[PDB]
Amino acid sequence: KYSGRDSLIFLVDASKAMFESQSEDELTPFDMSIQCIQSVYISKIISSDRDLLAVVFYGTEKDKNSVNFKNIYVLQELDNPGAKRILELDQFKGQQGQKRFQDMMGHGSDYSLSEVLWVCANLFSDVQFKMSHKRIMLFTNEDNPHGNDSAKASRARTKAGDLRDTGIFLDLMHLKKPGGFDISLFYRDIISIAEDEDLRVHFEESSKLEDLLRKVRAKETRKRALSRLKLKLNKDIVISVGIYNLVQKALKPPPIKLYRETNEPVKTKTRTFNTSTGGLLLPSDTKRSQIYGSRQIILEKEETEELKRFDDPGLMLMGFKPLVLLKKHHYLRPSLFVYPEESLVIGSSTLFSALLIKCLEKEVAALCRYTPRRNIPPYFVALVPQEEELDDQKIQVTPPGFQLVFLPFADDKRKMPFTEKIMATPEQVGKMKAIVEKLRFTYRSDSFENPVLQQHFRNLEALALDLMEPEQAVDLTLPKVEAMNKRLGSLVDEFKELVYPPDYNPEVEYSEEELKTHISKGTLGKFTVPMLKEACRAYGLKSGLKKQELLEALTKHFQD
């Protein structure tokens, strides 16, 4: 489960009608499919760069597969997506790309539709790793590949059923072409996802291919426990729970140092070097230290970690508090999640479920002392009972359990300056209400993307596929100032006149002698910090950052 990696095999048609299309600005379906596969590759390499992807063109004149089969070509075998794999594919884009494919692969050469499915299963069966999921998209612009030969259709159906039984779920992303037919036909009993749809006969547009939301270039999928703690209701009765995190800040992967001449990673070696007398030092002759004024406090390494140990790792329950006492203002860390686990203590789930039921029945939240690791000071936590919420599609959006809420200490609360309470009046609060109602918004969690991360990922894509210019991300968090201004209307000016007063716009060179004379002159004035710093550095005296440091040191030493 945890160590399994999802796997994907594309299946691009290369028929004659697959290439030739309507003569307009619309993309030929082959270019559309290649662009979509390239987009899927790009999305899946930045996000979860461990899955396996491979592309198997069928209908070609050439042939390359583990078992010799006519008109089936495996351009790439199952492996992690790579930049070279993307660049090996973009050469087929455009009319020149179409001609390159025709001269390098071919088209026509009527296929069987069964040996291709067998080949896909072969690569699926050739992997020495785990197989979390197995999927096969079938990019095709035709819906009735056969019909003049029922035997081939029956063989294809049998092979598809065998693949489904093995655990292979194929879903074709149908391509629309001029004409009037993309009918639900000899593909319906083959789609092993069997996605729910109206199954309307007279489709007249591209099928579920825009559903890719092409290039969702930000994701890092993972599920892990992150801790396994004991919840002590008392000294002797303890239960075992896991501490998951539902939302966590996303950061770009750290950079790697490289050797310029060879462009290969350079290993680093941090070690405390000699005391200007030669040799190396022990973790046993280097004690930690701190200085406060003229007093130096010398303290050993282990004693440094000894002074921040209070409790053994676990959640010590200390009582229940009403939910109405958990103010929204107080907040320090992202809220964690607790689920009952039964690996260290058997029977924790039953007590946990009873506690959850009777804790959200009385609208109370458990209060505990939280110590995640061995030597961390305790931190109080209010376990808010989060009841399971489910959609009509039987999809879990808020899984049941307890949610940590880090209550801040009094040290972590800052005090505001005194401000004078000035209240508004009617007849402009109403105007504000009208503006707000005119600016409705159904906020969703899947609304915005980190612009910095998006720009960095696009820059990396441009630097790995020489796109000749980075893709400019549409900054989704940028307000639509012109659209919202036009939607607002002139009532903003009515607001402005109503409250704002009419007059309210809202909108070296130094040496020995000059310093010797200046210390008696006593200014050291227009003398800037940048030039005091360079004087003290080039001369060799000890230097700091605050002005008074240099102003005292130079004055005391230069004369005395």
Binding site: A121, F124, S125
Partner: protein, 640 residues
């Protein structure tokens, strides 16, 4: 899942039919005994399903066979046996390669399954001989080759089974003469050490169905005269023990059958039988690679005693006798053949045979009457007869280069003899520079590329290679910096066409070359190999073939001298101080290849090796005008 499926289907074959696709899917995901369980599950249902070869090919079934695992390999052979009757010849040819690289395998159960599938593959691919497919006539040939190789394996039960299979009717005819004729078709040069014993075993096994097993006398304790079967069976039991009595038995049986055919046969058919036997013997002598002394001797012996087989290929006879060191029997065969144009070829081969065992007087005798018929050749040979190797070589080379002689245009054989005798005469003299150019000026133009040109038409290797390599070696130890073998030898250490030939005979030369450019660790190995090769050669030589054992024995002096030098240099204790050098010089000057008894090639070998050893010693450390004094004394003894 797979464990439970195998356990269930162990007694219930009908199940797992619906799981065939699944089990094939998980087959390449395992590496341990679970793979064996998967193959067993596959084995349960092989008959009721089709398109099996495609699935196995997709799952690299060929590769998993070559992995060393008794149970897995046995199960693989079993499934192959089961699905083979439904195979196709194109696929069977691919499947045959991994199963034939299996005769050298332990666990005789695997070999038994192998030979079972091979008996099947031989019975159905025998064919009515109508031309159907190349693969149908190729897999049968490949299988038949492996089956004969199974006649010499261990586990005498398996060998008995194979012998019964081979001796059954429709394969080896029950008729005596037909069986004898067909036995030649079972040569398989992979096995010939036991070929004579197996042939006589097949010949004498048929006599047990013969209706003759009474007491072959009338009996008269003074006499225990006993039936036939008590004499034939011990005869076979002793024939299959050692090769000499087996060779005698096969030769006697062949002669008896050949003599007895004359009654129940006609002359027109007799000619066909004799021609077939001669062709089979020629194939025997040509395809043989590990020349067996008694087998070759037996073949040539039965050839010699029949007027129809006297036309055996002289080149094959010469090559076989030279390689197996059985010169006298081939000499007698050629002499008998010459007692009843393709005659100078016989004379050339006879000369080549005689030259190997010394007897140079007879060589010169036959190099006059038959080869020759000129006036320069007789004078040159007369000059060479006496110890005069200057006039002979001079006039040989004078007769070699000429646009004259419009009085008969000397034959090619005489010119080849001229060149060979000129090279030999140059070797007797100390003219290595003169020898090398004339030895190498027979394969290409000026500055010949002595590389793979000698390694072609092996007559080149037989004639020019030894003289050329000896001349270059002697020149290099003389002091001349003319390094040309070093690259030649170094790039000759690749493959068998340039290394096995260069190691079977030339090992002292290789040792000298290697200790020349100091890598003495390999030179030691080469000299031990040379000593072992000399021991084998001496062991093969007869006991009454004098002047040939003496020739081989005269090189032990040089062999031991080089070995002692290598031992002396290796130990640094003797390098220090001068008394080890004094003792070595005293020992060397005391033992000499006695004069008036050893030809000068041995003298030259000894003296050149000793001088080169002294020169090499005179690089790490009196010890002057003393080493040179020893050198001068050795050279003076040479002159005397």
């Amino acid at each position: 899942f797979i464990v439970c499926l195998n356990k269930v289907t162990k007694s219930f074959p009908p199940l797992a039919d619906r799981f065939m696709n699944a089990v094939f899917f998980l087959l390449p995901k395992f590496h341990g005994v679970l793979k064996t369980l998967c193959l067993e599950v596959v084995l349960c249902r092989v008959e009721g399903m089709t398109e099996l070869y495609f699935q196995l090919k997709s799952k690299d079934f060929v590769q998993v066979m070559r992995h060393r695992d008794d149970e897995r390999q046995k199960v693989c052979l079993d499934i192959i046996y089961k699905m083979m009757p439904k195979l196709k010849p194109v696929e069977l040819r691919e499947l045959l390669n991994p199963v034939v690289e299996f005769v050298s395998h332990p666990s005789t159960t695997c070999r038994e399954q192998m030979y079972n599938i091979l008996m099947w593959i031989h019975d159905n691919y025998r064919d009515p001989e109508s031309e159907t497919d190349n693969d149908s006539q190729e897999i049968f040939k490949l299988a038949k080759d492996v089956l004969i190789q199974g006649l010499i394996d261990e586990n005498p039960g398996l060998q008995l089974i194979i012998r019964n299979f081979w001796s059954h009717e429709t394969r080896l005819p029950s008729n005596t003469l037909d069986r004898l004729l067909a036995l030649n078709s079972l040569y398989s040069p992979k096995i010939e050490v036991h070929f004579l014993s197996l042939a006589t075993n097949f010949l004498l096994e048929m006599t047990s169905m013969s209706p003759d097993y009474p007491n072959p006398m009338f009996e008269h304790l003074p006499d225990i005269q006993i039936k036939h079967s008590s004499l034939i069976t011990p005869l076979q039991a002793v024939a299959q023990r050692d090769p000499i009595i087996a060779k005698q038995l096969f030769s006697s049986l062949f002669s008896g059958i050949l003599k007895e055919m004359d009654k129940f046969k006609t002359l027109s058919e007799k000619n066909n039988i004799t021609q077939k036997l001669l062709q089979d013997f020629n194939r025997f002598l040509n395809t043989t690679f590990s020349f067996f002394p008694p087998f070759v001797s037996c073949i040539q012996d039965i050839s010699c005693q029949h007027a129809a087989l006297l036309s055996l290929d002289p080149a094959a006879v010469s090559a076989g006798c030279l390689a197996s060191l059985q010169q006298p029997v081939g000499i007698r065969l050629l002499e008998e053949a010459l007692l009843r144009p393709p005659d100078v070829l016989r004379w050339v081969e006879l000369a080549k045979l005689y030259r190997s065992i010394g007897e140079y007087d007879v060589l010169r005798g036959i190099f006059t009457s038959e080869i020759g018929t000129k006036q320069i050749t007789q004078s040159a040979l007369l000059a060479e007869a006496r110890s005069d190797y200057s006039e002979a070589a001079k006039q040989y080379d004078e007769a070699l280069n000429k646009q004259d002689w419009v009085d008969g245009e000397p034959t090619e054989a005489e010119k080849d003899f001229w060149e060979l005798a000129s090279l030999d005469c140059y070797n007797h003299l100390a003219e290595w520079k003169s020898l090398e150019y004339c030895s190498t000026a027979s394969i290409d133009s000026e500055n010949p590329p002595d590389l793979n040109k000698i390694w072609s038409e092996p007559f080149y290797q037989e004639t020019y290679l030894p003289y050329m390599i000896r001349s270059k070696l002697k020149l290099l130890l003389q002091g001349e910096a003319d390094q040309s073998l070093l690259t030649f030898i170094d790039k000759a250490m690749h493959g068998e066409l340039q290394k096995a030939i260069l190691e079977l005979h030339y090992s002292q030369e290789l040792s000298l070359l290697y200790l020349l450019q100091d890598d003495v660790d390999r030179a030691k190995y080469y000299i031990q190999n040379g000593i072992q090769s000399f021991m084998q050669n001496y062991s093969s030589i007869d006991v009454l073939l004098h002047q040939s054992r003496l020739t081989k024995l005269q090189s032990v002096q040089a062999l031991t001298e080089i070995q002692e030098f290598i031992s002396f240099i290796s130990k640094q204790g003797n390098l220090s101080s001068q008394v080890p050098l004094k003792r070595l010089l005293n020992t060397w000057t005391n033992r000499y290849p006695d004069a008036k008894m050893d030809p000068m090639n041995i003298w030259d070998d000894i003296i050149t090796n000793r001088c080169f050893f002294l020169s090499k010693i005179e690089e790490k450390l009196d010890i002057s005008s003393l080493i040179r004094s020893c050198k001068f004394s050795m050279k003076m003894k040479m002159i005397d």
